[PDB]
Amino acid sequence: MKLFISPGACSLAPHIALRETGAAFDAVKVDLATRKVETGDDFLTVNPSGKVPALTLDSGETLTENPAILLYIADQKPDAALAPRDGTLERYRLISRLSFLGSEFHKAFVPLFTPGSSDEAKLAASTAVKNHLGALDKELLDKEHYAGSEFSVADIYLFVMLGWPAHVGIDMSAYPNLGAYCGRIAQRPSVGAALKAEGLV
Amino acid sequence: MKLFISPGACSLAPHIALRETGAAFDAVKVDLATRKVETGDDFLTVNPSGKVPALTLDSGETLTENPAILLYIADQKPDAALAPRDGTLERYRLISRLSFLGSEFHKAFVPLFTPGSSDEAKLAASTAVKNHLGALDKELLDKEHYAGSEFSVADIYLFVMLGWPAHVGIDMSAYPNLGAYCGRIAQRPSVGAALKAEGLV
Ligand SMILES: N[C@@H](CCC(=O)N[C@@H](CS)C(=O)NCC(=O)O)C(=O)O
Ligand SMILES: N[C@@H](CCC(=O)N[C@@H](CS)C(=O)NCC(=O)O)C(=O)O
């Protein structure tokens, strides 16, 4: 199993998840600017869109999109309970949270990480992200975990994106429930090991 | 069970899925500007983001996010084969397709349907949509279905988004494979029923 990454990108989420399940895997770096794998392979052969993450299974089939990859990884080690069982309401609430993170929260950041973007795109995206952070802050005031009863791929995915505001001029002091949440998650051995393997600490 | 809609919006996809399965539900119109249900209720008490779709279950809980709502609808009637059984490779490929549609394709259109948006933002959004349409057009040449070998919720979801370009100045005659795909899907009675219920025909 090979996970295709770029350090600190949304690919960190499945990186942490594989460490949480103990799966055998290779973490392979991609140069997002040239779309080339560190091995020199053309990454567009693996993911035609050129984006990370991509997960190549032992069969040689490649899966894309964080929500699908993260569920796949959780489901291979049910004892880890990183996703609820098939046919529970909690399983749909998890998919809901993964779709919100990928479709709303992630995409809020894109102008802030585009040097091309206007002075006013950058400020409006600033606003959208700070709005998301305010609602996430109050949601996690009342609960330890982002989805259902216990630590899940949804917490892993949120945790990774809560590492982004500090790089685009947003002070995470305003969101102290998010602070503590990131605090607790960062102490997990899986999380420190992924942060170290990607060169982020 | 109530599905909160705005006519022709992405809430048409679960509306069509529910007519496919024959589940009992109320279709409930929302004025997205005033966040007011056609009943006069505050929509923010149902979905705090104020977006459609939202699906209130009989158990009384509310699901948001198309990918989650659409899988829930499919799995209420496993019989109808609108999604593969959970835990199969087929299931994760379907979740990958729903994530791509929700996070990449849907998001390209946002500036074209945002009341505020500049001419600049609309032109950029038009370019991103046409790039997606060219890719989808080539993918659907030698396919009949978007996901797997069967009509799925991913086909319903893509179908609805493919009805948007003609409303925002894009000429769909440049995408003949999408033209044929939409042509076939438009004959399903679920589609007529949903459109008529939303008052679009
Ligand atoms: N919808 C995709 C998004 C993947 C994505 O946008 N990845 C970024 C890194 S955070 C990337 O590879 N960007 C490079 C590019 O788009 O050229 C998912 O959820 O996996
Ligand atoms: N990621 C959400 C997005 C839903 C969405 O953007 N819905 C639109 C209609 S297509 C909406 O309610 N817009 C009103 C608003 O954003 O205020 C999903 O997949 O359910």
Percentages of chain A per state (helix, strand, coil), in multiples of 5: 55, 10, 35
Report d(CA A36, CA A33) in Å as an integer: 8
Which experiment gave this structure? X-ray
- Write out the two tokens for A116: 């091309």
Protein residue with least CA distance to atom 15, ligand 1: A51
Contact B109, B168 (CB under 8 A): yes
* Preceding omega of A67 cis (within 30 degrees of 0): no
Please count the other Cβ atoms lying within 10 Å of the Cβ belonging to residue B29: 17
State the DSSP code for A91.
Answer: H
> Residue B50: nearest ligand to its CA?
2
| Distance (Å) from the alpha carbon of A148 to chain B's nearest alpha carbon | 13
Q: Which residues of A touch B103 (CB under 8 A)?
A: 65, 99, 102-103, 106-107
**Helical segments of A11-118, H only:** 12-21, 66-75, 89-100, 106-108
Structural domains in chain B, CATH included, are 2-81+189-198 (3.40.30.10), 89-185 (1.20.1050.10)
- Residue bearing tokens 């119109």: B29
Which residues contact ligand 2 via a Cβ below 6 A? A 99, 103-104; B 9-10, 32, 50-53, 65-66, 102
Check B96 against A61: CB less than 8 A apart: no
Report d(CA A84, CA A94) in Å as an integer: 8
Report d(CA B61, CA A137) in Å as an integer: 22
**How many angstroms separate the most distant Cα atoms in chain A?**
48
Beta bridge partners of A37: A30
* Preceding omega of A53 cis (within 30 degrees of 0): yes
Please count the other Cβ atoms lying within 10 Å of the Cβ belonging to residue B59: 7
- Write out the two tokens for B88: 């199969």
Report d(CA B72, CA B119) in Å as an integer: 38
* Preceding omega of B53 cis (within 30 degrees of 0): yes
Report d(CA A185, CA B53) in Å as an integer: 32
Contact A131, A175 (CB under 8 A): no
Half-sphere exposure of B123 (CA within 13 A, CB side): 3
3-class secondary structure, B9: coil
Beta bridge partners of A2: A26, A56
